[PDB]
Write a protein that binds this ligand. Structure first.
Ligand SMILES: O=C1C[C@@H](c2ccc(O)cc2)Oc2ccccc21
Ligand SMILES: [Zn+2]
Lengths: 47, 161
């Protein structure tokens, strides 16, 4: 595991090209996330 | 010391989580290669993860970040897709769940798009798909995602492709 940029606690990947894409984020410390919900699913074959 | 509490599909908490899952599906530039081809999910179950130790550990660190960022933890709810969700819910996130070749470096990655985290459920690039059928687009096998509370604090902003 790497380090945050100095002075920062995480990175935000803001997609600049694909307008429909939402953001992605990166933390460098496990203790900065808590897994609250476990979701069990299937993807659905489209019509 | 983890326990899983089933939410009823009639509970509003189930419903708001389902909604964030379904409404954040998008199309992917790989045409479905990594995560398969779908516009929505069949949600089979939603469980609340309860672990005292892992929670206190999260809130302790959240206060530190907050105090370093004008009392603002900048907390989000984001999706994480991984082969190791069973280890994550019992022992928490650590460096064993880091994405060493990630675009923004070796850390633990989260998505606003549920469909993005889905691409990692069977491994990086979707791995070899479901264990049963070796199908990255399996419509039969059960998948699991986590919807997580993530402390971002002061986030470095990286514009990207
Ligand atoms: O939701 C995830 C999980 C993930 C990942 C999981 C396990 C692993 O070993 C490597 C990456 O990568 C991502 C990258 C970007 C956005 C979300 C994710
Ligand atoms: Zn399968």
């Amino acid at each position: 595991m790497a380090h945050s940029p100095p002075g920062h606690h995480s990175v935000t990947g803001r997609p600049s090209v694909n307008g429909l894409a939402l953001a992605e984020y990166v933390i460098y410390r496990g203790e900065q996330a808590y897994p609250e919900y476990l979701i069990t699913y299937q993807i659905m074959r489209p019509e | 010391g983890t326990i899983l509490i089933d939410l009823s599909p009639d509970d509003k908490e189930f419903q708001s989580v389902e909604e964030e899952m379904q409404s954040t599906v998008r199309e992917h530039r790989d045409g479905g290669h990594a995560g398969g081809i779908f516009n929505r999910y069949n949600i089979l179950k939603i469980q609340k993860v309860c672990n005292k130790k892992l929670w206190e550990r999260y809130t302790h660190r959240r206060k530190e970040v907050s105090e370093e960022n004008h009392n603002h933890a900048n907390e989000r709810m984001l999706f994480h897709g991984s082969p190791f969700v069973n280890a994550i819910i019992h022992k928490g996130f650590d460096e064993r769940h880091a994405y060493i070749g990630g675009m923004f470096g070796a850390g633990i990655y989260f998505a606003e798009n549920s469909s993005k985290s889905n691409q990692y459920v069977y491994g990086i690039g979707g791995g070899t798909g479901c264990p049963v059928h070796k199908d990255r687009s399996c419509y039969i096998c059960h998948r699991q995602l986590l919807f997580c509370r993530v402390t971002l604090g002061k986030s470095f902003l990286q514009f990207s492709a």
